[PDB]
Homo-oligomer: A and B are copies of this chain.
Amino acid sequence: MASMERFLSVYDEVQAFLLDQLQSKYEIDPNRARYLRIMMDTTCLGGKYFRGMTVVNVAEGFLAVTQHDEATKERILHDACVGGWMIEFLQAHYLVEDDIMDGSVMRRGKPCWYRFPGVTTQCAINDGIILKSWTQIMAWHYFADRPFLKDLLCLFQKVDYATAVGQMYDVTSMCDSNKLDPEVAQPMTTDFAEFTPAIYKRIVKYKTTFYTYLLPLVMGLLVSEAAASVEMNLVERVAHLIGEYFQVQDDVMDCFTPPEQLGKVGTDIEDAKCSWLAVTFLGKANAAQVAEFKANYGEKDPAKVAVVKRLYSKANLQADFAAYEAEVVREVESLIEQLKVKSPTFAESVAVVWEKTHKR
């Protein structure tokens, strides 16, 4: 059976499970069941399933080199699909809540969930809560007797926590740290002293890399009972490296990818985000360029946004991007080599993960 169709079939199975349990155990009525169904579909479906499919792909790699009964191969592939949907639903949770936090308008060429007429923020915050709660219901039901349940829940928990801490880093990235104070309305930085590579790397490491790369790889190892085919510190380092590159790519696209293709009007400049473009620009700008950046960044005025995009264009950040990209290529290839010592198979799964990211 082809992987994607297995994975989509499992979505249907998990959805039916969840909705049927709401009826039998939580006293739900048909209409609220239908609302939840629609919420689940709208918020969890229509992306590329990179995250969830990675769990499946890692598991398929191990199956090719490991002796098992056919029934066991099916059980492992089913568990990899359920685990992948746990990650897709965790992403859905964070995208619903982030879109509300950031006053976002669109996502994947459709309105953000909270903007749907019959949703509203009042419902949507809680819908996002339910999305993450479903990840736990899936795990407790499908992995009840599994030897990896403990480790999978502990890992998922750490990754969710890292992700929330990364959200905090992100939403506070345009403030001066010494001024953070619940009692005082937060001004935007005027110095931009905290727009540095290390501070950027902290934001992206926590906001995105743990859930997008670390969790899919380690979940495919867990459902395969293969965590001893790796050096976990290597897996962490390669996840964090690829994941950073993914985010840099997303930062450049927010500024330069046409909206119809982005699925999004990008507003990182207006929102004063600590983007790779802004940190790279401040790393090579002269005094007058720095001052012109400071006069225009973090403002909704389209003319000021056009001045920042011009400053980026004239600073030939494409060349810095190519240089960054070449260094990451170098480093990812090195880690892949190190991962072949313990597991050619796992190494190859990471190579595929890299190819997929590198070729967006």
Contact = CB atoms under 8 A, between A and B. Distances in A.
A153 interface: yes
Interface string A99-113: 011110000000000
Interface of A: 22, 26-29, 31-32, 34-36, 38-39, 42, 97, 100-103, 116-123, 125-127, 129-130, 133, 136-137, 140, 150, 153-154, 157, 160-162, 164-165, 167-169, 171-172, 177-178, 180-186, 202, 205-206
B125 A32 contact: no
A34 B125 contact: no
A159 to B, nearest CB: 10
A140 B154 contact: yes
Contact of A116 (B157, B182, B205): B182
B32 A177 contact: yes
Among A34, A178, A181, max chain B CB count under 10 A is at: A181
B160 A133 contact: yes
Contact of A38 (B39, B101, B161, B182): B182
Contacts of A180: 31-32, 34-35, 118
Contacts of A26: 162, 165, 206
A122 B102 contact: yes
Given A129-B97, A133-B160, A172 B123 contact: yes
Nearest to A168: B126
B122 A101 contact: yes
Nearest to A166: B26
